Design a protein around this ligand. Sequence first.
Ligand SMILES: CO[C@H]1O[C@H](CO)[C@@H](O)[C@H](O)[C@@H]1O
Ligand SMILES: CO[C@H]1O[C@H](CO)[C@@H](O)[C@H](O)[C@@H]1O
Ligand SMILES: CO[C@H]1O[C@H](CO)[C@@H](O)[C@H](O)[C@@H]1O
Lengths: 107, 107
Amino acid sequence: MGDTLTAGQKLERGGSLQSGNGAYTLTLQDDGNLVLYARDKAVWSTGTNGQDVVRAEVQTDGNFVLYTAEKPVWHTDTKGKKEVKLVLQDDRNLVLYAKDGPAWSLE
Amino acid sequence: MGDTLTAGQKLERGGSLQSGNGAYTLTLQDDGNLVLYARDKAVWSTGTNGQDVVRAEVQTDGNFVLYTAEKPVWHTDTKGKKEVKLVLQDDRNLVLYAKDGPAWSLE
Ligand SMILES: CO[C@H]1O[C@H](CO)[C@@H](O)[C@H](O)[C@@H]1O
Ligand SMILES: CO[C@H]1O[C@H](CO)[C@@H](O)[C@H](O)[C@@H]1O
Ligand SMILES: CO[C@H]1O[C@H](CO)[C@@H](O)[C@H](O)[C@@H]1O
């Protein structure tokens, strides 16, 4: 745990920065907030708690930024289906075949 | 120009699938909607228009999912600054030093 992020480096969930003397810790938490702690007492934060923040990156173009991960907005909900292939057939039916057979079709 | 998305594959902004007979087109659009067309007639949609959907992936586990891209929620706003580094100091101040001095801090 060092005290510097160079252009290209990023803090991820859990990952943090420690000051030289080891008094101050800037830590990107899993709650989505980048907090600064002075001996177990939060003194500043980004105020992004309750958000899906995955990385806090010092970019090349020259700005520190916190990004949300890619959020799922629509899914067929067929987790764990083996060897899946989506096919658009000539019968105007979009189907999602699996190892056992059709897992999802709009029909 | 194809009719199949095997495990791992995805549709990317603007990309599309085409049925064997060439009557039907599934296309992830720029506006965000995954829509199936019957030559100018939208027969089926995900209703994800308006959202920042970047890919529509047939995942390895089995689940076909649409994802909205990573969105910045907090930033320092110093784009255009050259050679930047974030530093948590012993005086407690967190500073983003640029090639021409401190670009952002707490003071
Ligand atoms: C909760 O787990 C399921 O949903 C997420 C996102 O919706 C997928 O990434 C994952 O593979 C599963 O299908
Ligand atoms: C409201 O319209 C939106 O959705 C339809 C599909 O229903 C598309 O044809 C159209 O380009 C837009 O994305
Ligand atoms: C007031 O001085 C402090 O704050 C400035 C921000 O302008 C830092 O650059 C500097 O190193 C000190 O920590």
